[PDB]
Amino acid sequence: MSKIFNEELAVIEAAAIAYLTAFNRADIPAVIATYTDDGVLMGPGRPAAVGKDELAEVYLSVFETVGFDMAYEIKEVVQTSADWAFVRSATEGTETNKATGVVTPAAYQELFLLRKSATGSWQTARYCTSKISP
Amino acid sequence: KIFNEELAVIEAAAIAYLTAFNRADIPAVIATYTDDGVLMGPGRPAAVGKDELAEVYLSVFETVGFDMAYEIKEVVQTSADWAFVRSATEGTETNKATGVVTPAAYQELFLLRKSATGSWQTARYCTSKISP
Numbered sequence A: 001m002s003k004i005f006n007e008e009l010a011v012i013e014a015a016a017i018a019y020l021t022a023f024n025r026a027d028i029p030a031v032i033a034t035y036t037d038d039g040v041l042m043g044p045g046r047p048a049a050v051g052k053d054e055l056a057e058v059y060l061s062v063f064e065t066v067g068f069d070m071a072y073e074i075k076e077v078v079q080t081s082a083d084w085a086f087v088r089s090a091t092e093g094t095e096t097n098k099a100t101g102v103v104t105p106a107a108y109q110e111l112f113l114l115r116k117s118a119t120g121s122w123q124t125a126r127y128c129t130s131k132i133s134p
Numbered sequence B: 001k002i003f004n005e006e007l008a009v010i011e012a013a014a015i016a017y018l019t020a021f022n023r024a025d026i027p028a029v030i031a032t033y034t035d036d037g038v039l040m041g042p043g044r045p046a047a048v049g050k051d052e053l054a055e056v057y058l059s060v061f062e063t064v065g066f067d068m069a070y071e072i073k074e075v076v077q078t079s080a081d082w083a084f085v086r087s088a089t090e091g092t093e094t095n096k097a098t099g100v101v102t103p104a105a106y107q108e109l110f111l112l113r114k115s116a117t118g119s120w121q122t123a124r125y126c127t128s129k130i131s132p
């Protein structure tokens, strides 16, 4: 009957979710901490942010400008080798502009490329998010 | 084999997509993907499988004319059969309805998988619009 989930896939998914929950709390240090030191963010309206200093600067600007209220869904979890994996997610909910106060619907889709650190921890090496709507 | 450095073969595969895309060559674009390939791009939900990929690229090229130059930012082989490539493109986009030409820049992540026959194919692909 039962489907058992590979223990390493469970730990990998938990690493992607650690980001999504930190992001939805707008907790920037928790967000930064999920990335490898050479991590890259590719998001809409901004060129790639490379490394924790550039990452911090982008997320600071995002949470200054906009408030997100989002639910996530995990779409796939795949381990491609001992130290590498990917996760695909989708988030949806609302976006509030902090200047104007205007709340609008928002949906995104995300790809995490995860790498297992030398001490056994899964971290986001590369991350891409695209806006589905509006 | 053409070059023994697998990294060059991997980069080659990503460049074949970007050039196919810039030529608006949909069959050539579809053929760079695995059968279960995923495209994640702006304004649309994930397209999963060649049937869904076809539909989206059809619609993109029905709606917009792209005139783009590419740059490869990184090529990384993570294991024997897996790699990633990060690139960026910039140029103009022309809306085919309105005729309005506007500057466009994008950034792209490829996850490529080496097939049973030795070909590098795109398994997962994300593109995000930098501007405007």
Ligand code: NA
Binding pocket: B021, B022, B023, B024, B065, B066, B067, B068
């Ligand atoms: Na073109």
